[PDB]
Amino acid sequence: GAMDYTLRKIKIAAAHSLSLGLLPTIVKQMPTQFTYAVEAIDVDQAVDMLREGQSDFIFSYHDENLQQAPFDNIRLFESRLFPVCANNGRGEPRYTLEQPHFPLLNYSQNSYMGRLINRTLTRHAELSFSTFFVSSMSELLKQVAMDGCGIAWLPEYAIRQEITDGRLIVLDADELVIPIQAYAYRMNTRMSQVAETFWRDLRGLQAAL
Amino acid sequence: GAMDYTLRKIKIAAAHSLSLGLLPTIVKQMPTQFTYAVEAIDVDQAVDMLREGQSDFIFSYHDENLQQAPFDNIRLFESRLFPVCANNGRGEPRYTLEQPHFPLLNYSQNSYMGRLINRTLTRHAELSFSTFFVSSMSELLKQVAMDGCGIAWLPEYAIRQEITDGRLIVLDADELVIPIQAYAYRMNTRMSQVAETFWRDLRGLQAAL
């Protein structure tokens, strides 16, 4: 946090859902000039950790609290959440959105994804669900969905290969698809030379993410 | 937490490193009588969440604070941490433990795994390391190791397939192997009928974990 210091350490706090997908790509593409300390957070911890200096950077989503001065940002990528479920052995979904009280696998209420998903379901009264499994961990939700336990909204980058080989099947590609946008956030304050170098390089590899 | 209640909800707090490996197996083998709320925690949050009723059960490791009355436990499985790294293209490790200041990929100090690993390295003065990447997330450490960025101590269950096809290579199988033991913890207090049914069924599938 505050007292911890090295010449090369970059302190990153990342929302649970993009930690796995985002961080390895950044490490691989970044110049060999940094060391990394990464902690997973809920989106509501982000403001305080940036203001108090416990994190140099936040990897998170759209956040109106963080999308104003004295914060700065770069949009890293955009994605789409699809409702998916396991297959039925014949290349068809095991579940339907129209089943009364279908089993839902969802993020926690404290999550950015969970908030958008419930907003969506509310708008759509022709769907009724029972929540079978709640977890902040995207990869846990994905595995429980792959094991056939219910329907889950998951981001495209996490399920890309499972959609291609059909271990997961997309159940809707219109009004139930949820847009999401990933950002890196910082304080406007000028930082150390190494953190400024990290920020500059991050801008330069954003295209390749 | 406390006020949240349904007839079937089982509230579980799990240490970061066994959440992915353990939880899907439990859901799959358990009778279809439960719903799940799972949150990831650091091991030091476990005592307070059990005493205050925010969690029914804790999935964690050996914890002397939790291995005494009024707590109860069942050992779920034991495993072994191996130092591993990516291959060098010829079926050999890319890194050696004997390289001066080899790049270490480690858990945070707040983690059970991190504590045992540093205890081990300290005992072994013929090794010197520089910490390249720190994260609580086992799956992030595994991916960074697979991408060739350094040496990491990882549990056998998480790297089993990568060891078999040689995307990760074990660097030591004697004095650097670290034993670990996974437990489920509860309060001694008698709980609701549904939580007692969950506890009884958990005992019954422990063999198959």
TrEMBL record, chains A, B:
Domain of life: Bacteria
Keywords assigned by UniProt, alphabetized: DNA-binding, Transcription, Transcription regulation
MF-aspect GO terms: DNA-binding transcription factor activity; transcription cis-regulatory region binding
Family affiliation: Belongs to the LysR transcriptional regulatory family.
Name listed for the protein in its UniProt record: Cell density-dependent motility repressor
Native species: Salmonella typhimurium
